[PDB]
């Protein structure tokens, strides 16, 4: 179980990377969501890792 929180803004990001955030439970810069560690979510984190921060 890892915690991921959006640190940057999706205003100048492409549509793919902007939908990659909505795929997770992220809709605002002040949010933080907890997910599992399956290999499916660590492709979304790799897609948008410059916009989020994964603590644990």
Partner RNA sequence: GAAAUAGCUCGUACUCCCCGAAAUGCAUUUAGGUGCAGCGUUAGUUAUAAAGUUAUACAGAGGUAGAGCUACUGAUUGGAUG
Partner RNA sequence: GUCCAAGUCCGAGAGGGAAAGAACCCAGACCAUCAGCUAAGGUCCCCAAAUAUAUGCUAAGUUGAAAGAACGAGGUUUGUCU
Partner RNA sequence: ACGCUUGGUAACCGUGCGUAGAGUGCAAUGGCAUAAGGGAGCUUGACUGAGAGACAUACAGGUCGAUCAGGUACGAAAGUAGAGCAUAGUGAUCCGGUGGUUCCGCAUGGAAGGGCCAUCGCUCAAAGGAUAAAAGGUACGCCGGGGAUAACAGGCUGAUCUCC
Partner RNA sequence: UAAGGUGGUUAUUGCGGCGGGGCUCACCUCUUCCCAUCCCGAACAGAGAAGUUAAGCCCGCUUGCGCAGAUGGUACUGCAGUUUUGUGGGAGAGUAUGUCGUCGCCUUUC
Nearer to RNA, 1 or 46 (CB): 46
Binding RNA (rule: CB under 7 A), the pick from 1, 12, 36, 56 is 12
User: DSSP class of residue 32?
Assistant: E
20 binds RNA (CB under 7 A): yes
Please state whether beta strands 32-35 and 52-54 pair in parallel, antiparallel, or not at all (unpaired).
Answer: unpaired
29 binds RNA (CB under 7 A): yes
CB atoms within 10 A of CB 52: 20
Please state whether beta strands 2-6 and 52-54 pair in parallel, antiparallel, or not at all (unpaired).
Answer: antiparallel
Residues that bind RNA (CB under 7 A): 8-20, 22-23, 28-29, 39-40, 42-44, 46-47, 50
């Amino acid at each position: 179980k890892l915690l991921v929180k959006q640190v940057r803004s999706k205003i100048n990001c492409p549509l793919s990377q902007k939908r990659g955030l909505e795929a997770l439970g992220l809709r605002k810069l002040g949010q933080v969501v907890e997910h599992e560690s399956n290999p499916a979510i660590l492709g979304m984190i790799n897609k948008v890792k410059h916009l989020v921060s994964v603590e644990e």
